[PDB]
Amino acid sequence: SMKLTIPELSLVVLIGSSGSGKSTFAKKHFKPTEVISSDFCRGLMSDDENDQTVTGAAFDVLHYIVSKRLQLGKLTVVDATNVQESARKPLIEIAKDYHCFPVAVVFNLPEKVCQERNKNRTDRQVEEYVIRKHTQQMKKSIKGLQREGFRYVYILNSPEEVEEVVFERQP
Amino acid sequence: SMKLTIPELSLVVLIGSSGSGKSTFAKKHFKPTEVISSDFCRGLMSDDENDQTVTGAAFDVLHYIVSKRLQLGKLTVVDATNVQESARKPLIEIAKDYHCFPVAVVFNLPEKVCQERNKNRTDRQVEEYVIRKHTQQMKKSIKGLQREGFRYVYILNSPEEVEEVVFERQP
Numbered sequence A, B: 001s002m003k004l005t006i007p008e009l010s011l012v013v014l015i016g017s018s019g020s021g022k023s024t025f026a027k028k029h030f031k032p033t034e035v036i037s038s039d040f041c042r043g044l045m046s047d048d049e050n051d052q053t054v055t056g057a058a059f060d061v062l063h064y065i066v067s068k069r070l071q072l073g074k075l076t077v078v079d080a081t082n083v084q085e086s087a088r089k090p091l092i093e094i095a096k097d098y099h100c101f102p103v104a105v106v107f108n109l110p111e112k113v114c115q116e117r118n119k120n121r122t123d124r125q126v127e128e129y130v131i132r133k134h135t136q137q138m139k140k141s142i143k144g145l146q147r148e149g150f151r152y153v154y155i156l157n158s159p160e161e162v163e164e165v166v167f168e169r170q171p
């Protein structure tokens, strides 16, 4: 098993390409109400999924809901790609604002693995260019995560490592 | 600052080339008796500095002393290069046996930084090829450290980051 320690009061930031299995992992490891996803927040703004005009407000709404949860001292997982520094930055600030530990959980899987899961998805899909870009972005992000303010940085380097994860909420 | 969390019961494994500032860092951040260096253990076997003829005995002594400390449940810092997996693995296994958390602190500094420091040393110096090799070995080591069994992996990527470090011991 790969034991990843997180404090009871954490902001768990999932980092990974579309198709890297963030939501699947989130559903396996955390309670449904602990998980705030970008899909969910966009859905509050529009029932039209491909509406790129609501993306900003959805980010704002994601940040706000997370802020209020952490404020209440409730462990929260951000289920969004988070492969751009600009997306991670406000989460870190939120975490530090409410004295939570920001934790990065990085799905450092090959692009091919994500591309294939994507094609095999029945719920919703993205175009292949999206995952190519995500994967490059995820990779460029790894080295700097600790410097960004993440107190614990856990890089999962393969499907088997992802599968073997057990969280220990010791602190 | 760069906050690194370590449990009260830790085996803190410093990982860095000769010249990367391990002992300097150890002296700044830890009590002298918490630090066990390969150089100290070698010195118990021989008067000659960096006596390469007693290396195996020196590391045996290091492992023994480290094991006895962890047995007493006392936080220990291993101040050796630890750039080889064969050097790290027994520390991980020692930690696991005494139910302690192994923590990796990696001095991921550019080679030239270490080379420069090396030449200004009054204590002892190594040849350039040694530091080249250590740095290569260190860099190769980084990705797999979590998988090796390190519970927390902290990579310090520049002197600035190294300087900024503050440890938080959660007891």
Ligand SMILES: O=c1ccn([C@@H]2O[C@H](COP(=O)(O)OP(=O)(O)OP(=O)(O)O)[C@@H](O)[C@H]2O)c(=O)[nH]1
Pocket: A016, A017, A018, A019, A020, A021, A022, A023, A024, A025, A080, A081, A117, A118, A120, A121, A122, A126, A159
């Ligand atoms: O180990 C796994 C994990 C996930 N999957 C499969 O991968 C597909 C994508 O899995 P997810 O829907 O969990 O990916 P994601 O959250 O990272 O994707 P975005 O919302 O960012 O777009 C799903 O169909 C899932 O069943 C596997 O096949 N094996």
Ligand SMILES: O=c1ccn([C@@H]2O[C@H](COP(=O)(O)OP(=O)(O)OP(=O)(O)O)[C@@H](O)[C@H]2O)c(=O)[nH]1
Pocket: B016, B017, B018, B019, B020, B021, B022, B023, B024, B025, B039, B080, B081, B117, B118, B120, B121, B122, B159
């Ligand atoms: O931030 C620093 C840290 C250290 N140094 C200087 O670099 C030199 C080496 O620093 P150390 O002697 O602490 O390196 P080390 O323990 O990693 O090396 P080995 O035992 O493995 O050989 C020392 O002379 C120190 O003063 C700096 O110039 N700046």
Ligand SMILES: [Mg+2]
Pocket: A022, A023, A024, A079
């Ligand atoms: Mg998802």
Ligand SMILES: [Mg+2]
Pocket: B022, B023, B024, B037, B039, B079
């Ligand atoms: Mg030293």
Ligand code: NA
Pocket: A021, A024, A025, A026, A028, A162, A163
């Ligand atoms: Na999973």
